[PDB]
């Protein structure tokens, strides 16, 4: 007859369903078309893990091979024909993990934070989502992950680059400033602003520093920080002026190149990761996304398909 | 039936109980004595004490025992298997004897492992016994032809509704059916455990029923109890891995059970499949991966 796993495959477009089924090739294809995922290698743990949960086992008779049971999320209604695998991974689970990521960011554990963030980001396509808004949250969740990943990754590099040349220094300040734009939560956003302010201050680009200081204050950082910020701000006011011109436009909209960590203003051509939304300069197109690590930058895709609602007829 | 307790203990899954009782029972008949020995060894096979069966059953033993021993060697020696099947094929074709039910069951069992469902089913077709019917249904379920399975079940159902063997069979069909049926399967497993005794087999069956339905948490107790009795029990560990993920246990937990399974039985087909999946995944990765 037809195996239950096969039934699941026939029944659902969702990639997780196929993984549960054990149909890797099918699942990979779905991930490849719906999302960009060219490089499956980072996926392997997720697949096996997901795969393991798919079916239960019980023994009909002794000394014979054990039987397998396939749980269905719609067990009641599903007949033999319309079964679909039980869930097992949910949006809340992913959201919960996010806090741990936040914690690591605050501590300065950025490298570890990236891993957790990326782990969640990759996991999003696995989900089966019940309602339309819930789908939006998933998309939003992914966005948050890339934002941190690119931002944190940019930060790690900035620290690495050499301080010695003036040009080198200008580069650092620029990158620090770029971080400012990243959409993080206020606790983190404040932290980055704090950093940028100092770099700009030493740079003697006081005018720009003043703007950062004001933005920081609005956030409402702890009192000690706020006081320090006010102190710096007043100093900046004495000589509001930027000594050097930097390749940074606070006002102009940006898009940080995930690879280059260079600004891409407004309209200027950009290539984006189908999955993450990470942005890259046109040169990168066709390459593996640094943020996602699985995806192809240039790839056009159907789009994430977490819920059956997405399919319409 | 004098043997009733011994056999019943066997089907439920409490092998040791079967063995103990088998010894206590008195022969009272050359026929019965043979049946008793058959179950006694069958129990040892369940236990995986192959050596016991191979050593003790000797050529002089009754043909029924011989069949059991045949199965034992098949399980025990991987190398021997092709040779055994070949001989089995020869014996099956070159010899009519239907009467030996034990032979049919053992032979069918070998075919089943051989993954020659047709042959096993073919053999079982000849056998009249109630057990033969139960085995037949099980094979049909694996075949995923629930419909055929249902027919056999009723067939046995007419003969003996109350028999535990029949009840187990119904539960199986039941579990396959899905839906409201699942609850029915759950009760039968529960009732058996209550009456006879919770066996690892029975506990997992209950767990499977609960898991089929959403009730992951309810499943926890049965698996936990089963695990306590026997770590390394294949069905239990597998169920635990599945259960753990639904519960939201830490990923390490799922991994731990999986590793534990490997320790208990490197060979276990679940493990093999897992490995197989890993292999093709790597294979697939190369397919998608960019060239360099």
Author numbering:
A (entry chain A): 913 to 1225
B (entry chain E): 17 to 308
Study authors write:
Coat protein 1 (COPI) coated vesicles function in retrograde trafficking between the Golgi apparatus and the Endoplasmic Reticulum (ER), and between the Golgi cisternae in both retrograde and anterograde directions. Coatomer (the COPI complex) is a heteroheptameric protein complex, consisting of α, β, β’, γ, δ, ε and ζ subunits. Arf1-GTP recruits the protein complex coatomer from the cytoplasm and anchors it at the membrane. Polymerization of coatomer at the membrane assembles the COPI coat, which recruits cargo molecules and membrane machinery to the assembly site.
The linkage structures are at lower resolution than that of the leaf, so we fitted our leaf structure as a rigid body to assess which subunits are close to one another in the linkages. Consistent with our previously published structures the central contacts in linkages I and IV are made by the αε-COP subunits, and those in linkage II are made by the δ-COP MHD. Interestingly neither ε-COP nor the δ-COP MHD are essential for COPI function and the combined deletion of both is not lethal for yeast. While the contacts formed by these proteins at the linkages may play a regulatory role, they are therefore not essential for COPI function. The slightly improved resolution of the linkage structures obtained here compared to our previously published maps showed that the density that we interpret as being contributed by a flexible hydrophobic loop of the N-terminal β-propeller of α-COP, is in the vicinity of γ-COP in a neighbouring triad. We found that βArf1 is close to the N-terminal β-propeller of β’-COP in a neighbouring triad, and approaches the trunk domain of β-COP. While the low-resolution of the linkage structures precludes more detailed interpretation, the proximity of the peripheral βArf1 molecule to neighbouring triads suggests that βArf1 could modulate inter-triad interactions.
